[PDB]
Design a protein around this nucleic acid. Structure first.
Ligand code: 0KX
Ligand code: MG
Ligand code: MG
Ligand code: NA
Ligand code: NA
Length: 325
DNA sequence: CCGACGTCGCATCAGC
DNA sequence: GCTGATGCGA
DNA sequence: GTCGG
């Protein structure tokens, strides 16, 4: 709320660069700037004040001035009144449609929800689903419902094998009063970095959730990542809207790196990996490795908590609550 | 003043 | 049926 | 767009 206008502005500008100009690094610059300002504990009162923050340069400082002085930004107005930019901006909000495809549709005269629906023959499976539940995916999820979903997921997982461990990551583990979707970290002793002894570990769980009709649709699926759709049973009351669900099977010994990645926030993670690079380290959802002078990563260093990974790169441990950067 | 910018999974594609 | 990338997403 | 460095 504090510098809400500025952050909203930069976020809107960011989406425009990602979705329309297809400049993902401008999009990341703008989102990093908004982040740096979101943590800035003062009401920013000039572009000069903002420029001193890392990630804010001249161009954003000038825009911050125009906004503080006028309450708007002409660039945003020009963008908002462009059909092309707006149609493109909008189509990207459908799951499966990004900058490239959204433009392909607009080039083809396809720009409305209605336009998409009479041209379903042009949508792959993913895009088809994201369109079917576009209205449902636009709603956020009460934590009260997340808990309901958590009991269901954790329980079905138990039934397949009692040695499975399921953990609801994402914004939920960050204690958010509501969430965009459900992210589940999953482990099993059979699957480590040192071997895969059992086949179809993710698959079994997906089928179990499907056979009991928790999971309804499937965007994409692999041996370690499931991306789909699920729904709380309503009693018949109105139907709960469908929700996105991601499941990520991480090798059990690499759990702490996995839960670190999967908990977020996204721009927390980016800045953290950016920092690790400033220390001769590199991090993914699996490991933390020391960068060789040659660029090539050395062996995975031992890790036994999210904190361990913080220590390696000299950073104060921060509970999930404070990672929503 | 240029170049790099987190790091990966899944579906697919241009070259072999 | 691989590598290396695009595209989209986490 | 920013900063590295
Ligand atoms: N670009 C990205 C996107 C997601 N992620 C990681 C951190 C995210 O918290 C985690 C799950 O992504 P997510 O479900 O899209 N967003 P998240 O759970 O943080 O908040 P919601 O908007 O879903 O409530 O994936 C990332 O590391 N880099
Ligand atoms: Mg989430
Ligand atoms: Mg998710
Ligand atoms: Na700066
Ligand atoms: Na999209």
């Amino acid at each position: 709320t504090l510098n809400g206008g500025i952050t909203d502005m930069l976020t809107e500008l960011a989406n425009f660069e990602k979705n329309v100009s297809q400049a993902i690094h401008k999009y990341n610059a703008y989102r990093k700037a908004a982040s740096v300002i979101a943590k800035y504990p003062h009401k920013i009162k000039s572009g000069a004040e903002a420029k001193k923050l890392p990630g804010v340069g001249t161009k954003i400082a000038e825009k911050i001035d125009e906004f503080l002085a006028t309450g708007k930004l002409r660039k945003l107005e020009k963008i908002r009144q462009d059909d092309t930019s707006s149609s493109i901006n909008f189509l990207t909000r459908v799951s499966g449609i990004g900058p490239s495809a959204a433009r392909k549709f607009v080039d083809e005269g396809i720009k409305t929800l209605e336009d998409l629906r009479k041209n379903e023959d042009k949508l792959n499976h993913h895009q088809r689903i994201g369109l079917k539940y576009f209205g449902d995916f636009e709603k956020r999820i009460p934590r009260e419902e997340m808990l309901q979903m958590q009991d269901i997921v954790l329980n079905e997982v138990k039934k397949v094998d009692s040695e499975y461990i399921a953990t609801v990551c994402g914004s939920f583990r960050r204690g958010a009063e509501s969430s965009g979707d459900m992210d589940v970290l999953l482990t099993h002793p059979s699957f480590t970095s040192e071997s895969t002894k059992q086949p179809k570990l993710l698959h079994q769980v997906v089928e179990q959730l499907q056979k009991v009709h928790f999971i309804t649709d499937t965007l994409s699926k692999g041996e370690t990542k499931f991306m789909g759709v699920c729904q709380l049973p309503s009693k018949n009351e109105k139907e709960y809207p469908h929700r996105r669900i991601d499941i990520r099977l991480i090798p059990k010994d690499q759990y702490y790196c996995g839960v670190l990645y999967f908990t977020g926030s996204d721009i927390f993670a980016k800045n953290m990996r950016a920092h690790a690079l400033e220390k001769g380290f590199t991090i993914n959802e699996y490991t933390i490795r020391p960068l060789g002078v040659t660029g090539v990563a050395g062996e995975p260093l031992p890790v036994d908590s999210e904190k361990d990974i913080f220590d390696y790169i000299q950073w104060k441990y921060r509970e999930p609550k404070d990672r929503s950067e």
